[PDB]
Design an enzyme around this catalytic site. Structure first.
Site, PDB file in Angstrom:
ATOM      1  N   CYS A   1       0.806  -1.205   0.000  1.00  0.00           N
ATOM      2  CA  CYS A   1       0.000   0.000   0.000  1.00  0.00           C
ATOM      3  C   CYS A   1       0.849   1.270   0.000  1.00  0.00           C
ATOM      4  O   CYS A   1       1.686   1.477   0.878  1.00  0.00           O
ATOM      5  CB  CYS A   1      -0.963  -0.008   1.199  1.00  0.00           C
ATOM      6  SG  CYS A   1      -2.095   1.418   1.244  1.00  0.00           S
TER       7      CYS A   1
ATOM      8  N   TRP B   1      -9.493   5.520  -1.003  1.00  0.00           N
ATOM      9  CA  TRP B   1      -9.780   6.258  -2.220  1.00  0.00           C
ATOM     10  C   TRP B   1      -8.709   5.913  -3.263  1.00  0.00           C
ATOM     11  O   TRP B   1      -7.596   5.521  -2.923  1.00  0.00           O
ATOM     12  CB  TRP B   1      -9.922   7.770  -1.963  1.00  0.00           C
ATOM     13  CG  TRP B   1      -8.760   8.453  -1.314  1.00  0.00           C
ATOM     14  CD1 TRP B   1      -7.607   8.868  -1.926  1.00  0.00           C
ATOM     15  CD2 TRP B   1      -8.654   8.863   0.060  1.00  0.00           C
ATOM     16  NE1 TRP B   1      -6.799   9.509  -1.024  1.00  0.00           N
ATOM     17  CE2 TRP B   1      -7.414   9.521   0.203  1.00  0.00           C
ATOM     18  CE3 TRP B   1      -9.489   8.738   1.182  1.00  0.00           C
ATOM     19  CZ2 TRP B   1      -6.986  10.056   1.428  1.00  0.00           C
ATOM     20  CZ3 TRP B   1      -9.063   9.270   2.399  1.00  0.00           C
ATOM     21  CH2 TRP B   1      -7.823   9.921   2.510  1.00  0.00           C
TER      22      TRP B   1
ATOM     23  N   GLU C   1      -4.442   3.474 -10.837  1.00  0.00           N
ATOM     24  CA  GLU C   1      -5.170   2.214 -10.682  1.00  0.00           C
ATOM     25  C   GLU C   1      -6.303   2.120 -11.708  1.00  0.00           C
ATOM     26  O   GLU C   1      -6.593   1.046 -12.228  1.00  0.00           O
ATOM     27  CB  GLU C   1      -5.773   2.107  -9.277  1.00  0.00           C
ATOM     28  CG  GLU C   1      -4.782   2.056  -8.138  1.00  0.00           C
ATOM     29  CD  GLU C   1      -5.479   2.077  -6.793  1.00  0.00           C
ATOM     30  OE1 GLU C   1      -5.887   0.996  -6.317  1.00  0.00           O
ATOM     31  OE2 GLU C   1      -5.641   3.178  -6.224  1.00  0.00           O
TER      32      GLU C   1
HETATM   33  C1  HEM Z   1      -6.612   6.196   1.687  1.00  0.00           C
HETATM   34  C2  HEM Z   1      -6.190   5.891   0.431  1.00  0.00           C
HETATM   35  C3  HEM Z   1      -5.443   4.773   0.008  1.00  0.00           C
HETATM   36  C4  HEM Z   1      -4.680   4.734  -1.144  1.00  0.00           C
HETATM   37  C5  HEM Z   1      -4.444   5.812  -2.198  1.00  0.00           C
HETATM   38  C6  HEM Z   1      -4.144   3.398  -1.267  1.00  0.00           C
HETATM   39  C7  HEM Z   1      -3.550   2.977  -2.445  1.00  0.00           C
HETATM   40  C8  HEM Z   1      -3.241   1.687  -2.713  1.00  0.00           C
HETATM   41  C9  HEM Z   1      -2.737   1.221  -3.993  1.00  0.00           C
HETATM   42  C10 HEM Z   1      -2.381   2.050  -5.224  1.00  0.00           C
HETATM   43  C11 HEM Z   1      -2.618  -0.118  -3.872  1.00  0.00           C
HETATM   44  C12 HEM Z   1      -2.267  -1.056  -5.029  1.00  0.00           C
HETATM   45  C13 HEM Z   1      -3.488  -1.767  -5.590  1.00  0.00           C
HETATM   46  C14 HEM Z   1      -3.156  -2.675  -6.758  1.00  0.00           C
HETATM   47  O1  HEM Z   1      -2.127  -2.427  -7.430  1.00  0.00           O
HETATM   48  O2  HEM Z   1      -3.927  -3.635  -6.998  1.00  0.00           O
HETATM   49  C15 HEM Z   1      -2.970  -0.477  -2.500  1.00  0.00           C
HETATM   50  C16 HEM Z   1      -2.913  -1.739  -1.961  1.00  0.00           C
HETATM   51  C17 HEM Z   1      -3.330  -2.049  -0.663  1.00  0.00           C
HETATM   52  N1  HEM Z   1      -3.818  -1.145   0.285  1.00  0.00           N
HETATM   53 FE1  HEM Z   1      -3.932   0.787   0.147  1.00  0.00          FE
HETATM   54  N2  HEM Z   1      -4.514   2.592  -0.195  1.00  0.00           N
HETATM   55  C18 HEM Z   1      -5.369   3.409   0.550  1.00  0.00           C
HETATM   56  C19 HEM Z   1      -6.154   2.948   1.579  1.00  0.00           C
HETATM   57  C20 HEM Z   1      -6.109   1.689   2.132  1.00  0.00           C
HETATM   58  C21 HEM Z   1      -6.913   1.284   3.275  1.00  0.00           C
HETATM   59  C22 HEM Z   1      -8.004   2.128   3.933  1.00  0.00           C
HETATM   60  C23 HEM Z   1      -6.461   0.035   3.643  1.00  0.00           C
HETATM   61  C24 HEM Z   1      -6.870  -0.764   4.742  1.00  0.00           C
HETATM   62  C25 HEM Z   1      -7.359  -0.419   5.967  1.00  0.00           C
HETATM   63  C26 HEM Z   1      -5.421  -0.305   2.660  1.00  0.00           C
HETATM   64  C27 HEM Z   1      -4.795  -1.543   2.541  1.00  0.00           C
HETATM   65  C28 HEM Z   1      -4.070  -1.946   1.409  1.00  0.00           C
HETATM   66  C29 HEM Z   1      -3.669  -3.317   1.158  1.00  0.00           C
HETATM   67  C30 HEM Z   1      -3.635  -4.496   2.120  1.00  0.00           C
HETATM   68  C31 HEM Z   1      -3.223  -3.373  -0.102  1.00  0.00           C
HETATM   69  C32 HEM Z   1      -2.603  -4.601  -0.767  1.00  0.00           C
HETATM   70  C33 HEM Z   1      -3.650  -5.410  -1.525  1.00  0.00           C
HETATM   71  C34 HEM Z   1      -3.068  -6.601  -2.269  1.00  0.00           C
HETATM   72  O3  HEM Z   1      -2.021  -7.146  -1.839  1.00  0.00           O
HETATM   73  O4  HEM Z   1      -3.672  -6.994  -3.293  1.00  0.00           O
HETATM   74  N3  HEM Z   1      -5.215   0.721   1.729  1.00  0.00           N
HETATM   75  N4  HEM Z   1      -3.385   0.661  -1.778  1.00  0.00           N
END
Ligand code: HEM
Ligand code: HEM
Ligand SMILES: NC(=[NH2+])NCCC[C@H](N)C(=O)O
Ligand SMILES: C[As](C)(=O)[O-]
Ligand SMILES: C[As](C)(=O)[O-]
Ligand SMILES: [Zn+2]
Lengths: 414, 416
Positions: free
Chosen positions: B120, B292, B297
């Site tokens: 993330c 968000w 993405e």
């Molecule tokens: C607030 C804005 C947030 C942004 C901009 C953000 C952005 C991202 C991005 C760009 C990815 C890559 C997705 C992909 O390539 O498929 C990601 C993955 C992830 N995010 Fe964030 N995130 C945010 C919020 C969150 C929240 C609220 C949680 C959890 C409480 C979180 C947990 C994760 C996890 C676990 C992944 C990995 C998923 C995987 O391994 O497939 N994120 N996030």
């Protein structure tokens, strides 16, 4: 044991069985992955105060000889058993041995083939190996270097090559080329912490001046070579301007681009890496191929710690540099890469764009799967610096490991 | 020098040491022989289901460790409250085989799992997360109400708010609470007669599962799918999200007037719903979380991936680019305009979005914070660096160390 590898675009699956041949350790462990580190002490081949003990050298030597005779299919013949006999007899008496020219040629191509960070590996079998093991002075190194350059350049029709200088011996210093590439642009520290030219070459530029070079003050001043013979101070050698082919950069539609005065050399030749073949280490073995447009347009000219021309070009394009959401960086970067491809093509100089390159690497991964059961690749280096997911390599999972022969990093001679 | 990983930033020339990796208690996929860090689903990042409760000792060490993390965060390590809680947990596990978290412990662990997520890039917001406790939920019907409340709160009419809803944990000798869909909002993918796909090719299997469970399908590229919610030991029940609840954004370009005519669009809320939330050994099989989007993405991965919408050629043809030769950089050009269109459309509709430049610059700030706070930050380089303009963002030049820390969000097998 054998990693399951998947391509997410095609959904295809392969099993890498080649990683089992790896005898050298990487920086990773089960506790943490260090695959994103550029220079780990593992890929490095530092000094030493005593020669490598025969047991280890002999096993690396026998393995390489096994690899070689297996390549010419004579695996088992008398020539094989006698070559092994020779290596063993020489190591037992001298604690070292020497390679034959045919063996050295097989080993160099195989080092390239085994290079995880190289996306141009489909061309691995096409390599001119210049034997320079009969070099005894820096002056001779220069002559050899000039021959490598004139051959490789070929008036614009670039050809991959490598010049192999004398291996390292336990009883003396190394043959070294101080410069990281045969062609580099000067980086002058200007009073106000600023830098004229290439910021990556500041240190080497200073050494050249410390060794008597009369420096200029342009942004694209080709540096002289600091060649070092064993236990001798490096000597300065200025490359003949006619040997150094350069391409002035212009844009196909933006007339003002040329006015920027940008340009770059045609020949990419790394000269600071160590070539290891069968336990033998060659501290000076410069190699060259041809550029992939992103190396010049993206990295060399757009990296913040390099030429960093991104903003200047954006302004010339009259882009919104106020916010990042206008994607001014992205737009400018595309045009610069475009200018690079147009320019090299206009000047009849070999160049490959990142799409063509990665498409050919996917074919190479396929060839190696059938040939060796896998292929060592460093994802972060294989995937280009711009438009990563627009290319096939991005959606291909990769396994990274060390195979020998190998090009490895080594300490700076100073 | 120091016995920990030395990490360098090549743009700035700065060095840092990662001491936080020393706290890792879960093994990754790599070994000194080879790096398997580029694998998306290595069997090392997945937590297989369980036909038996976790052995009372492995669960205890994990539970004890989590409680120590909790008490250290409130600065009461070694206290009477700390010691009593540990005794209370091993007393629970002693007679029931499992234990239960206090309200605040759940809020802490949920925020910690996000904080610990290596993939993330938006972790600078980790401290700001709305944790909806739903551990009292007992039916698939209630699951839907909870999700509808989550979607309404998180969407907040364009001014998005990060949130997570935690449903009952895994109980041995009892079925799991599961949301079948990968995300709360997903576009249907219809397998055509000619082998092709209309809509989202990534959603072909779930779309077919929805149809098999009574859903009457549409025939559009952007049909929102219904939820397949499953309560313990019951078959999954189908629930249709009220259209007013699903905020979408019609895509247009700031200058290319014909772009609006393409009929492209994307939903505002990114909510992963098939991931497992692991806290102190306890497993929450259904705990959908949302934040968000980062413009790349949608514009790059979702719309331009060959195995997704694959609209690159269509837009290039509209831009009148030479799609016959690679060296024209038609893919790069089209992709740039598609990302610009996403950003322009979201900013116009007043819906929250962040470009890849701003996102990565804020992640660097997060790296500095975490360096001082915990002595490092586990980060998966391949996932942190954006799908376009890689070396143009600061994170590309930053070496990263990747490792697993708990609490964590882990992958789980499909319930079917
Ligand atoms: C607030 C804005 C947030 C942004 C901009 C953000 C952005 C991202 C991005 C760009 C990815 C890559 C997705 C992909 O390539 O498929 C990601 C993955 C992830 N995010 Fe964030 N995130 C945010 C919020 C969150 C929240 C609220 C949680 C959890 C409480 C979180 C947990 C994760 C996890 C676990 C992944 C990995 C998923 C995987 O391994 O497939 N994120 N996030
Ligand atoms: C034939 C044309 C070639 C092309 C288009 C090509 C392209 C590339 C690219 C894009 C990189 C990454 C450079 C960077 O990001 O700094 C690379 C690295 C490398 N290439 Fe190739 N390559 C070619 C030929 C060769 C040849 C002739 C050799 C060796 C005999 C070679 C050996 C390597 C090695 C060892 C690396 C790693 C360098 C490092 O770690 O700094 N390449 N190549
Ligand atoms: N030259 C390259 N292709 N490098 C790829 C990324 C390597 C390293 N993580 C960095 O900081 O840049
Ligand atoms: C070319 As403009 C400054
Ligand atoms: C839609 As066409 C330009
Ligand atoms: Zn690794």
């Amino acid at each position: 044991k054998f990693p399951r590898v998947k391509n997410w675009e095609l959904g295809s699956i392969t099993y890498d069985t080649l990683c089992a041949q790896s005898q050298q350790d990487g920086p990773c462990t089960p506790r943490r992955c260090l695959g994103s580190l550029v220079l780990p002490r593992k890929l490095q081949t530092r000094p030493s105060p005593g020669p490598p003990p025969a047991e280890q050298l002999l096993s690396q030597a026998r393995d390489f000889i096994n690899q070689y005779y297996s390549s010419i299919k004579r695996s088992g013949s008398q020539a094989h058993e006698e070559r092994l006999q020779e290596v063993e007899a020489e190591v037992a008496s001298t604690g070292t041995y020497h390679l034959r020219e045919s063996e050295l040629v097989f080993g160099a191509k195989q080092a390239w083939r085994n290079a995880p960070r190289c996306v141009g590996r489909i061309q691995w079998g096409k390599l001119q190996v210049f034997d320079a093991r009969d070099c005894s002075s820096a002056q001779e190194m220069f002559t050899y270097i000039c021959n490598h350059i004139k051959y490789a350049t070929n008036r614009g029709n670039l050809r991959s090559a490598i010049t192999v200088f004398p291996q390292r011996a336990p009883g003396r210093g190394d043959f070294r080329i101080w410069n990281s590439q045969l062609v580099r642009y000067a980086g002058y520290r200007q009073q106000d912490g600023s830098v004229r030219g290439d910021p990556a070459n500041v240190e080497i530029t200073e050494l050249c001046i410390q060794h008597g070079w009369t420096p200029g003050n342009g942004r694209f001043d080709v540096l002289p070579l600091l060649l070092q013979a064993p236990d001798e101070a490096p000597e300065l050698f200025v490359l003949p301007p006619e040997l150094v082919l350069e391409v002035p950069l212009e844009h196909p539609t933006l007339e003002w681009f040329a006015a920027l005065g940008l340009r770059w050399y045609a020949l990419p030749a790394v000269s600071n890496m160590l070539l290891e073949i069968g336990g033998l280490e060659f501290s000076a073995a410069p190699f060259s191929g041809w550029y992939m447009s992103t190396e010049i347009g993206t990295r060399n000219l757009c990296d913040p710690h390099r030429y960093n021309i991104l903003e200047d070009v954006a302004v010339c394009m009259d882009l919104d540099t106020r916010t990042t959401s206008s994607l001014w960086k992205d737009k400018a970067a595309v045009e610069i890469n475009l200018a690079v491809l147009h320019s090299f093509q206009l000047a009849k100089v070999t160049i490959v764009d990142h799409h063509a390159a990665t498409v050919s690497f996917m074919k190479h991964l396929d060839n190696e799967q059938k040939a060796r059961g896998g292929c060592p690749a460093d994802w972060a280096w294989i995937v280009p610096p711009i438009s990563g997911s627009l290319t096939p390599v991005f959606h291909q999972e990769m396994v990274n490991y060390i195979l020998s022969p190998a090009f490895r990093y080594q300490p700076d001679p100073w």
